[PDB]
C-alpha cells in the first residue's frame, strides 16, 4: 500500500505545506520547522523524489499557499495547476527592474528619514519589497489590458507608493511639505517591457485604519457602472481594479475587515474581486500578534468568503512579484478576492520615543542583525551568478543617483434651476407602475399600490412613498443615473416602496422606474435605476455609498437606514468621511442619507435618527440636513440635491406612521408648480382665509409632530396660536425665517417644539444659534419637548403617549 | 489504483459531505443532491473495513441531517477527536430521552400558540419554525451541568425571547407577563437549570441587549469573563475549566453582516479577553426580514465568519430535534477539551411574517409556497417516532394532552395573573507603591530606557513633583492595596501609547513580563489583599473592546474597569455601546456599570484624529445620573478622580479625557500632600489665590476653561503680569458643579466679563452644551457669558500643524486682548 503514504502525503503538502513554509524574513519562531527511486502514478508516472521536490517547492519554499478551504473545486485545480509546476526562472531583465524598483524604494526611505524631522512612523524600511510587489500587481492589470486600478491604504510607505506606483513627481509629493498622508491622487501607469498602460489612483483615508476599505470598493463599483463593465455592464471584465493594503494588527481586528469582504460576490456590491495585500511586520505598534489575534495568519478572516491566501517571505521580491501576478490571474478567472500576506518587519520603531527593544526585545535584536531587501536581493542575485559584480556595482550607483535625485529634485522645490416637473413626467411614473411585462403575475396585495399609484399622477393626494419614486423617477427622465439601497429597501421597511415587485408565480422581479431610463420615442435617456437590498451591515454599507459618490459625482446615491437609530453602527463613516472629507482632503461626495425618524412608541432603538449629533458634526457648506413634513417638499429637496450641481451630503429624517398619515399628502399643483421650501406656514395663511395679526404665541416645530399640533389648533379654533415648521435645519434658513416671522407682527412668545428630549433633537444647537443669529426674532425663544433622556426615548408606549400628549398641552396650554 | 481511490472519498466526504447534508427542512435548492466501482463495495480495504461499509459510515456521519465543518483546523487532534465522535455508530436515545425532548417542542410550540393568540403586536418575536431551538438549548445547559460547570450565560436578540425565559431560563409566567412590555425583550435574567436525568443543577443567566443585532456579542464575553475571574475559573484562575459558558444566540442575515461578530471572534483566544469558548447557536430561517441570503452574504453559509479562528461549524436540520440535541452536546464536549469556540447552524424557517404588515409572499413567494406547506417541528416528530415505533399511538395522544395542558397552563397562570468619602491615602501608600518599581524580581533585566522612569517612580513617591502617569498607577496601586480587582487595558496600554504608563516591564534578555503595581495584592506581614492588577494590550478593536470592557463591569460591579483608546479619536468605532449600552443601560433596563473610559484628547497639530475625543457627543449623550465626564488638569486630581470612582459605592460610568503632551508638562506635577491631605475638586483655582499671595478682587476678567489649555493660559498670565485676569478650571464636566461652581465665582466680586475657553472648534468641546445650559442653571452668574475657541468646523482640528499653532496663539492672544 506505498502508493497510498504517496496520496496521504500529496494532500498533507497541498493542505498543511505553508505550517512548515519558511515566510518569516526574521526566522522568530525556532520550533517551525527508501521508495524516492520509485515511479508511482500521478494525475503520468515519476519518482517520488521528483514528486516530493515539487511539492516542497510549491508549499514550502518562500510562498505558504491556503486553497484547500475553497469549496469551489475547479479553482482548487487552478491553483493547483500553477503552483505544482517547475516554473521558469525571470529574466535578467526582470530581476534587474525587480532590483531598480527596490533601489527606488529604499533611496526614497533613506531621503525621508534623514531630510525631514517626525518621519519615522511612516517608515516602510523592512516592508520595500511591498513596492516591486504593487508594481507586479498593477503591470500584471495593463497586461490583461484593464482600465484603472484603484489603492487604498493605510499611511505606511505611502508617499513611497506616490512617487514609485503612482508615478507623482517629488515636486508635487514635497509641495509645501502630514494632510498629504490622507490625500487622493491619479496618475498613469507604463508597462517597462509590455505595450499597455493603466490608470492608477490612490482614495483619500483617515487614520481609522481599514475605515476606507468599504469606501475604495464603493468608488470602484461606480467606476465600473460607469464604464459599462462588470456586474451592471455588458462586459464581464471588471476593469477597474481594487488594490487594498493593510497591516496585520489592523487587518485581523476590525470589524470593517469582514463586513467589507461580505460585499465581494454580493450583485450590489461585487467589483469582481480585490486584491489585498497585508504589510505584515508582525508587530502592531508595541503589540506581538499573540495579543491582536486567535488564529495562526491576520488574514484568517478571508476564509469567510473562500479567498486564496498566499503567505510570501518578504526577503524574496522574486516570489513577491510572481505571487502578485498569479493574484491578478486568479481574480480575473473567478471575479473573487485574493489576499497576499507580505511577511516583513519595522525595521525602526513605531514613532519618535519608540526604543522598540522596550516591548519586543528579542525581535529588534533580529531586526537589528538585519540588511535590507535591496542589499540581501542584490548579493542572492550574485550568489546566484545572475548578475556580475559590474552589474552589481551599477545597481549600487543605481541606488545612489536615485537617492541623489530625490534631495536634489526636493532642493529645486524649495528654491521656488427649478425641480418643479410637468404633468406629463407625473403621468408617465404613474402609468409605469402598470406597465408590466408580458405574463407578468403581481401579487394582489402590491396590485392596489400600483392602481393608486396610476390614480394619485392623475389625480392628486400624493403620499410620501410615491413622491419619493416621483423625484427619482423624474430624475432617470431626465438622464441621471441613480442608485437606493439599504436592509429591505426594494420593498420598504414600512412596506410603502416597492421599487422592485415579485412575480408572484416566478419569483422574477420588475422595477418600474427603469421604464423612465427609455424615452417615449424609444431612444435611452441615459439614466438608470439601480436599486438593492442591502447586506445587514451599516458599517460597509454607508462606506460604500459614500465612496460610489466620490466615485461618480454625476450619480444620484442614497442609503437607507432600516430605522435611523441603526445608523451609529456607521459612525466611523459619518464622522470620518461623510461630514468632514471635503474640508480635509478637499474630496466631495453627494452622498444622501434617509434615516427613518419619529416618536411612535416603539423603543429607544426605533424612535431616533440622532438629529442633535448630525446637527453637533454640521458647519457651513459641509451638508445639507432636513425633515420634510410633506411629499411634494421631499420631492422638491431630492430634484434640488440631485441638479444643484454642487457635491455635498444630505441627510434626510423620513417618516415611518407619516408615511400613511391622510393629512400628509400633496397635490399635484405642489410638484408641477412649486420649489423646495425651507421654511413652511400653515396652508390658512398661505392658502386659506386665516388671519395672521390674530396670532400672538409662534410654535416653531419640523417634523411629523406638526400634524397633531394643527390638528388641536383646528379642534380649539386656537386662531392665536400659529404653526411654522423648519424643514432645512442645516443650513438654517435665516432668510425665510425673517420673513416668515414678519408676518406676524403681534407675536408675543415664541417656542420651539419638538418630540425628541430636551438634550436631543434640534434644541441643543437651535436653542443656542436661533438667539444669535435672529436676535430680534429669537430672544426669549422656550422649548416645548420631551425632558432631558439617556436615551433616545422611554421604551414604554404608554409613557410615550402620556409624553406626546404633555407636550400638545403644553403647547396649547 | 483502488485503496487510493478509497482515501481520496474517505476526504471528499470529511472535506465536502457537509455540501449534500439535507440540512435545509425546506428542500428549497432542488440541484443540492445532482452535483455532488459496485464491484470494489465488497472488497476490504485498509483496520479493514469492506468499502460499503466505509460509504455507510461516511453517509451517515456527515451526508444525513448534520453538516460537519471541521478539516480547515489547523490543529491534527482536535480534527481527529471530531472524527471519532462523528464517524461512529451512535447509541439511539431512549423513549425517556425522545419523550423529554418531545416536552420541550410541546412547551416552546405551546407558548408560540399563545403569544400569537394572546397579545396583539407579538409576530416579530415568533419562534415559530425554530421551535427546535429550545430542545437545542436545554441539550447545551444539560451537558455543561454534566460537566459540573457553575453557569450558562445566555446573549440573544428579541426572536423567541420570551419562550428561552420560561422554558430555559425556568422564569414563571407571573413575571414574564406581569405589567405587559417591549422592554420584556432587552432586559437581563437569571434563573437555576435543575437536570431531568442528572443529579446537577446550574445557573441560567441571559443579559440586557439592545435592538441592535449582534452589538451585545462582545458585551457577553466580557460579562463571562468577569464571572470566570470572580470564581478563579479559567485564564486568570487556579483552574483551567472556563465554568462560566457564554451561550450566544445569532440571527442568519445578522450573524453575516455584523462587524462586531468577527472582532469578537477574534477575542476567543486572547489571554486578554478568552472565555473558553463559547457555544454560538445561529437560528438559521434563511431570510432576513424581507432579504433572501444570496443579497445578505458573499459565502455558502452564514457561519463562515467562524472559520477565522478555525472553529467546527456543524449545520443542522432544525426539523430533527436529536440531531439537533445531539451536536449541542458533542460542541459542548468539544468546548470543553479545546477551550475554543463551536459554531451550531440550525437551519430551519420563518413561519410567519416579519413583523405585522408583511405579508412575505410579496418578496419571497417561492419560500412562503413552500413554508404554507409546512407542519410544525412538534407534528414533524411526533410522526416521526410513530413511524420508527419508538413511541405508541396513546404516548403519541398523552403528548398532544402534554402540548394541550401547556397551552392551558400559560392561558391559565396569565389569567390568574391579570385577576391580581475620602480618597487620600497615607504618605507609606505612596512609597510602597514607589519601592515596588525597584523591587525586581531575582536576575530581572530592566531595559536602559526603562530603569530611569522606576528610579523617578520611587524618587516621587518619597520627594513629589508626581507626574500623570504616576499619579494613574497610584489610584489603581492603593486601590489593589485595599483589596479591589483593577482591570486595565487598551491599544498599546501596558507600556502606554505616549510611552509613559510601564504597567508592565519587559526582561530585556528573556522577554519575561513584570508587573510592579502586583506586588500591593500582598500585604506587607505576607498576606493577600484581596486585590489583583490584571492588564493586557488589547487587539486592534474598539467596538468589541468597549464591549468587553461594559461587559466586564456588569460581571463584577465590585472592579475597577478601565479602557483606554489609543487616542480618544478612535472610541467612534466603539460608538454603538457607547449610545446603546454605556450611557443609557441604566435608564433602559436597570443594569449598572461603573466602566470607565479613558480617552487621550487635547490640540497639538497632530490632526483631525489624533485631538478629540469628541467631548460635545458624550456632553450630549449625558442626562442626569447616567455618567460622570471629566478632564483633570492635574495628577492629584486624576489620582482622587480614579479613587472616588472605585470607592463611591456607586455604578456609574466615567468618561476621562486624558492627557498626551501634557503628561510631560513641568508645571502639570503634584505636591505628595495633594494626594495625602486632599480630596477630588470639581473646580480647581489657581494656586496664587489658594495658596499663594495673588488678590481675588483685582480680577475684573474671568477665564472658565478645563485642560492643558490652563497651562497656557496661566503662563500668559504671569507673563504680562495679568492681575485683572484669573483663570478657573471646570474638573468635571458632567454633571456640572453648580455650587462649586456658584461659591467659586463669589470669591471675585469685581468680575464685569466671563469667557468659556476651550481649543475645540466653536461647534466642539464644552461650548455647545455649557453656552446653553450655565446661563441657565446660574442666571446670576453665567447671563452673558462669552465664548473663545476655534472656529466651527466640520472636522475636530485642522490637518495642519502651522493652521493649528496660528490658531492656538489666536486663542490665548483674544483671552487677554
Ligand atoms: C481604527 C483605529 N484604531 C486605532 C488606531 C491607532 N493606531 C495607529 C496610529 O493612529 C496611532 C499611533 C501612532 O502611529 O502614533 S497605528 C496603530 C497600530 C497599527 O498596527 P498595524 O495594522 O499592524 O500596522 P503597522 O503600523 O504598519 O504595523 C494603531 C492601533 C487607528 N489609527 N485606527
Ligand atoms: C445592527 C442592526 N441593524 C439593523 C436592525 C434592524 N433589523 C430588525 C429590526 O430592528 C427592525 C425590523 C422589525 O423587526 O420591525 S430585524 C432585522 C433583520 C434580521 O435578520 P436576521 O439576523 O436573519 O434575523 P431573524 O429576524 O431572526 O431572521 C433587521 C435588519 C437591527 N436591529 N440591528
Ligand atoms: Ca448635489
Ligand atoms: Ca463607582
Ligand atoms: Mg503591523
Ligand atoms: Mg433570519
Redesign the pocket.
Given at each position: 500500500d506505498k502508493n497510498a503514504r504517496v496520496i496521504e502525503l500529496i494532500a498533507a503538502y497541498r493542505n498543511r505545506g505553508h505550517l512548515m513554509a519558511d515566510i518569516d524574513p526574521l526566522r522568530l519562531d525556532n520550533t517551525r520547522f527508501w521508495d524516492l527511486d520509485r515511479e508511482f502514478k500521478v494525475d503520468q508516472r515519476k519518482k517520488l523524489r521528483d514528486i516530493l521536490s515539487v511539492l516542497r517547492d510549491a508549499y514550502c519554499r518562500h510562498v505558504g499557499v491556503e486553497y484547500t478551504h475553497i469549496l469551489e473545486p475547479e479553482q482548487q485545480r487552478w491553483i493547483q495547476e500553477r503552483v505544482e509546476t517547475k516554473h521558469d526562472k525571470p529574466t535578467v531583465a526582470e530581476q534587474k527592474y525587480i532590483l531598480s524598483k527596490l533601489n527606488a524604494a529604499e533611496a526614497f526611505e533613506t531621503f525621508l528619514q534623514t531630510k525631514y524631522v517626525g518621519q519615522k512612523?511612516f517608515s516602510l524600511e523592512g516592508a520595500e519589497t511591498v513596492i516591486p510587489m504593487m508594481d507586479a500587481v498593477i503591470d500584471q492589470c495593463a497586461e490583461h489590458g484593464l482600465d484603472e486600478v484603484v489603492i487604498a491604504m493605510?499611511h505606511?510607505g505611502r508617499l513611497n507608493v506616490l512617487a514609485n506606483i503612482v508615478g507623482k513627481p517629488y515636486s508635487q509629493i514635497f509641495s509645501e511639505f502630514d494632510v498629504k498622508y490622507h490625500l487622493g491622487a491619479t496618475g498613469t501607469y507604463i508597462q517597462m517591457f509590455g505595450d499597455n498602460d493603466i490608470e492608477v489612483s490612490l482614495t483619500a483615508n483617515p487614520?481609522?485604519?481599514?475605515?476606507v476599505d468599504p469606501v475604495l470598493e464603493g468608488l470602484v463599483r461606480a467606476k465600473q457602472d460607469l464604464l459599462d463593465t462588470g456586474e451592471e455592464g455588458s462586459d464581464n471584465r471588471f476593469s477597474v481594479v481594487p488594490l487594498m493594503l493593510h497591516?496585520?494588527?489592523?487587518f485581523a481586528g476590525?470589524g470593517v475587515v469582514a463586513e467589507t469582504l461580505n460585499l465581494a460576490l454580493l450583485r450590489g456590491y461585487r467589483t469582481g474581486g480585490t486584491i489585498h495585500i497585508v504589510?505584515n511586520?508582525q508587530?502592531?505598534?508595541t503589540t506581538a500578534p499573540t495579543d491582536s489575534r486567535s488564529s495562526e495568519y491576520c488574514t484568517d478572516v478571508a476564509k469567510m468568503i473562500g479567498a486564496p491566501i498566499f503567505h510570501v517571505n518578504g526577503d524574496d521580491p522574486e516570489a513577491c512579484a510572481w505571487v502578485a501576478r498569479l493574484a491578478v490571474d486568479f481574480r480575473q478567472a473567478f471575479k473573487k478576492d485574493v489576499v497576499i500576506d507580505m511577511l516583513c518587519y519595522?525595521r525602526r520603531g513605531?514613532?519618535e520615543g519608540d526604543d522598540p527593544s522596550m516591548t519586543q526585545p528579542y525581535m529588534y535584536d533580529v531586526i537589528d542583525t538585519k540588511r535590507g531587501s535591496r542589499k540581501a536581493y542584490t548579493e542572492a542575485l550574485i550568489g546566484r551568478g545572475d548578475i556580475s559584480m559590474k552589474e552589481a556595482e551599477d545597481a549600487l550607483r543605481d541606488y545612489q543617483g536615485q537617492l541623489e535625485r530625490v534631495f536634489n529634485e526636493v532642493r529645486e522645490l524649495e528654491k521656488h434651476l427649478a425641480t418643479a416637473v410637468d404633468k406629463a413626467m407625473l403621468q408617465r411614473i404613474g402609468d409605469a407602475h402598470l406597465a408590466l411585462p408580458e405574463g407578468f403575475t403581481v401579487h394582489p396585495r402590491v396590485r392596489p399600490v400600483l392602481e393608486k399609484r396610476r390614480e394619485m399622477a392623475y389625480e392628486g393626494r400624493i403620499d410620501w412613498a410615491f413622491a419619493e419614486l416621483l423625484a427619482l423617477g423624474s430624475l432617470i427622465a431626465e438622464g441621471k443615473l441613480v442608485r437606493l439601497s439599504g436592509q429591505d429597501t426594494q420593498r420598504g421597511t414600512f412596506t410603502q416602496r416597492h421599487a422592485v415587485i415579485v412575480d408572484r408565480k416566478t419569483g422574477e422581479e420588475f422595477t418600474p422606474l427603469q421604464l423612465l431610463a427609455t424615452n417615449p420615442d424609444g431612444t435611452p435617456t441615459g439614466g438608470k435605476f439601480l436599486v438593492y437590498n442591502s447586506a445587514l451591515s451599516e458599517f460597509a454599507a454607508v462606506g460604500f455609498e459614500y465612496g460610489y459618490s466620490v466615485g461618480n459625482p454625476d450619480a444620484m446615491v442614497l442609503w437607507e437606514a432600516q430605522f435611523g437609530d441603526f445608523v451609529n453602527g456607521a459612525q466611523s463613516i459619518i464622522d470620518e468621511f461623510i461630514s468632514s472629507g471635503e474640508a480635509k482632503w478637499g474630496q466631495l461626495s453627494d452622498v444622501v442619507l434617509l434615516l427613518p425618524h419619529g416618536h411612535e412608541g416603539q423603543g429607544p432603538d426605533h424612535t431616533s435618527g440622532r438629529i442633535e449629533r448630525f446637527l453637533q458634526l454640521w458647519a457651513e457648506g459641509s451638508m445639507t440636513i432636513a425633515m420634510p413634513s410633506t411629499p411634494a417638499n421631499y420631492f422638491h429637496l431630492l430634484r434640488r440635491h440631485g441638479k444643484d450641481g454642487i457635491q455635498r451630503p444630505l441627510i434626510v429624517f423620513t417618516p415611518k406612521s407619516m408615511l400613511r398619515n391622510k393629512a400628509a399628502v400633496s397635490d399635484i399643483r405642489d410638484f408641477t408648480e412649486s420649489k423646495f421650501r425651507s421654511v413652511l406656514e400653515e396652508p390658512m395663511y398661505t392658502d386659506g382665509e386665516g388671519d395672521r395679526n390674530k396670532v400672538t404665541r409662534l410654535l416653531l416645530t419640523s417634523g411629523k409632530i406638526y400634524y397633531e399640533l394643527a390638528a388641536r389648533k383646528a379642534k380649539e379654533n386656537r386662531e392665536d396660536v400659529a404653526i411654522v415648521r423648519i424643514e432645512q435645519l442645516a443650513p438654517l434658513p435665516r432668510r425665510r425665517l425673517a420673513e416668515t416671522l414678519d408676518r406676524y407682527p403681534n407675536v408675543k412668545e415664541k417656542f420651539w417644539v419638538q418630540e425628541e428630549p430636551a438634550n436631543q433633537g434640534a434644541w441643543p444647537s437651535f436653542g443656542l444659534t436661533l438667539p444669535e443669529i435672529l436676535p430680534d426674532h429669537f430672544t426669549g425663544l422656550k422649548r416645548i419637548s420631551r425632558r432631558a433622556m439617556s436615551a433616545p426615548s422611554s421604551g414604554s408606549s404608554k409613557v410615550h403617549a402620556v409624553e406626546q400628549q404633555e407636550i400638545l398641552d403644553t403647547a396649547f396650554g
Open positions: 512612523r493605510p505606511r487614520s481609522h485604519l481599514e475605515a497591516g496585520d494588527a489592523a476590525q504589510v511586520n508587530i502592531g505598534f519595522r513605531h514613532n
